[PDB]
Design a protein around this ligand. Structure first.
Ligand SMILES: C[C@H]1O[C@H](O[C@H]2[C@H](O)[C@@H](O)[C@@H](O[C@H]3[C@H](O)[C@@H](O)[C@H](O)O[C@@H]3CO)O[C@@H]2CO)[C@H](O)[C@@H](O)[C@@H]1N[C@H]1C=C(CO)[C@@H](O[C@H]2O[C@H](CO)[C@@H](O[C@H]3O[C@H](C)[C@@H](N[C@H]4C=C(CO)[C@@H](O)[C@H](O)[C@H]4O)[C@H](O)[C@H]3O)[C@H](O)[C@H]2O)[C@H](O)[C@H]1O
Ligand SMILES: OC[C@H]1O[C@H](O[C@H]2[C@H](O)[C@@H](O)[C@@H](O)O[C@@H]2CO)[C@H](O)[C@@H](O)[C@@H]1O
Ligand SMILES: [Ca+2]
Length: 441
């Protein structure tokens, strides 16, 4: 599917090894060693498509699917591009997962790596010429202040860095992504390690995909990130990630979030193609950093209802709180896939708002109220409106703001209350327990 189709999607980002063990997995004692395979499978994820859909997601980003070197539970350590990772299942089981998702109106986005291979023996790498030393840069330690180093040095000391300027390597990866997409029928691609490969590799690779591509450029600098924005369909919104977290963890005002939202939006071709996220598999979970479910809900209100494509990290809906990798990659079966959890029902409510408004694909995010401790905005000409704050659990405040809609009525989706703006479009609302208020006409 094309960029335009993805703009209205809502993405659940899952580690395949960490969702479900089988079609019959309805929960169990968790996985003890999070640095090793926990036993999630394609067939297990297939049995959880209803669980995912029931919160309002209509797309799943899965970690890489290719055969990996030892202990590559996360998929990022390729050893054979043209074989599936047997720990998750066979090729036919991967097709069955995708086909099951398509039958339920769900897109599958596949994560891919072109920068590097795994840490297994060179002589087991496939296909040719990946088993030749000459296919790689000599090993060097990355200096993140030097772009040459970022591109030619190793992302980790044991992960050989491909010589991506070699025409033979460029054709290997183009032919491979075309085969992958044709064979398995994926709807989109997440491109790992984009800043680690020279820019002129990317357009041909992205176009070979045949679908929307979203790139990972791990940087808070919006100028740097936006320099990749014309090479692929969208980018992960790392620039917003930083001040998003600083506001909702009570570290800074909302002004830096609004500033960065405006700045990155102005620098890319189409800010509706950016992927908005609060946490992921490479950073501690929100609740590890700030143990306050009210603040998490406020932050997630931005993720779900701001401009851009929301990307929610699996386990958020069970209030997971693990810290740095691998502790942020807890299995989901320990939670027993509780569809009555507080966070599950929260995601389900915001998913219903998105569904009733077309998946909110517009470039129509109007800042309404921007203060030390509060942020409100609307979408769709005032049809949907969010008031968020960083006051925290157990706190009450009144916030009054101009809605730009005269004499208009909304319903609070959480509290059921009727909210009416005045003749001047001014609305006052009182936040309770630090919880966000979402308003729908
Ligand atoms: C992970 C991420 O790293 C890089 O991001 C950098 C970024 O480029 C930097 O600029 C900087 O970011 C700055 C930012 O620019 C600023 O604007 C902001 O203000 O501050 C931030 C933070 O300073 O830092 C980040 C993070 O370092 C890449 O650019 C990015 O693409 C990466 N994300 C991708 C990439 C990969 C690789 O495909 C995936 O990671 C996977 O592979 C790693 C490496 O194997 C694995 O790591 C875990 O397992 C390792 C084995 C373990 N290391 C142990 C092994 C040793 C010997 O072998 C010991 O030497 C070592 O001490 C041991 O700990 C790792 O610690 C452990 O994390 C991942 O699990 C695996 O997933 C990413 O997932 C993918 O999204
Ligand atoms: O509630 C204060 C103020 O917030 C908003 O103004 C933003 C503006 O939209 C941003 O572009 C940037 O300039 O930050 C301003 C706040 O410092 C509302 O737009 C405005 O109506 C309201 O009074
Ligand atoms: Ca490289």
């Amino acid at each position: 599917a094309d960029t335009n189709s993805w703009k209205s999607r809502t993405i659940y980002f899952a580690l395949t090894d960490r969702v479900a063990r089988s079609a019959s997995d309805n929960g169990g004692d968790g996985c003890g060693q999070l640095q090793d395979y926990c036993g999630g499978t394609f067939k297990g994820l297939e049995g959880k498509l209803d669980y995912i859909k029931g919160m309002g997601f209509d797309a799943i980003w899965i970690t890489p699917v290719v055969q990996n070197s030892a202990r590559g539970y996360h998929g990022y350590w390729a050893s054979n591009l043209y074989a599936t990772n047997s720990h998750y299942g066979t090729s036919d089981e991967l097709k069955g997962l995708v086909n099951a998702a398509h039958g339920k109106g769900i897109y599958i986005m596949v994560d891919v790596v072109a920068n590097h291979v795994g840490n297994g023996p060179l002589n087991e790498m496939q296909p040719a010429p990946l088993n030749q030393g000459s296919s790689y840069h000599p090993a060097c330690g990355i200096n993140y202040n030097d772009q040459h180093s970022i591109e030619t040095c190793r992302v980790a000391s044991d992960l050989p860095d491909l010589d991506t300027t070699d025409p033979k390597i460029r054709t290997l990866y183009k032919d491979w992504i075309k085969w992958l997409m044709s064979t398995y029928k994926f709807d989109g691609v997440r491109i790992d390690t984009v800043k680690h490969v020279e820019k002129d590799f990317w357009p041909d690779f992205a176009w070979a995909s045949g679908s929307y591509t979203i790139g990972e450029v791990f940087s808070g600098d919006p100028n740097y990130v936006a320099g990749y924005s014309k090479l692929m369909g969208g980018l992960l919104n790392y620039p917003v990630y930083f001040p998003l977290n600083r506001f909702y963890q009570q570290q800074n005002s909302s002004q830096a979030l609004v500033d960065m939202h405006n700045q990155i939006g102005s620098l890319v071709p189409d800010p509706t193609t950016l992927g908005t996220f609060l946490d992921n598999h490479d950073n501690p979970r929100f609740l590890s950093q700030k143990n306050d479910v009210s603040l998490f809900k406020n932050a997630l209100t931005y993720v779900l209802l701001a401009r851009g494509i929301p990307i929610v990290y699996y386990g958020s809906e069970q209030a997971y709180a693990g810290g740095g990798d691998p502790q942020n990659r807890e299995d989901l079966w320990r939670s027993r896939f509780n569809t009555n959890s507080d966070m599950y029902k929260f995601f389900q409510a915001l998913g219903g708002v998105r569904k009733s408004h077309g998946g909110l694909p517009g470039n129509d995010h109007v800042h309404l109220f921007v203060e030390s401790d509060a942020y409100a905005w609307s979408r769709q000409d005032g049809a949907v409106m969010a008031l968020t704050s960083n006051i925290g659990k157990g706190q009450q405040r009144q916030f009054c703001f101009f809605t730009q809609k005269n004499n208009k009525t909304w319903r609070g989706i959480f509290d059921g209350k009727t909210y009416t703006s005045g003749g001047d479009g001014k609305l006052c609302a009182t936040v309770n327990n630090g919880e966000p208020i979402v308003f729908v006409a």
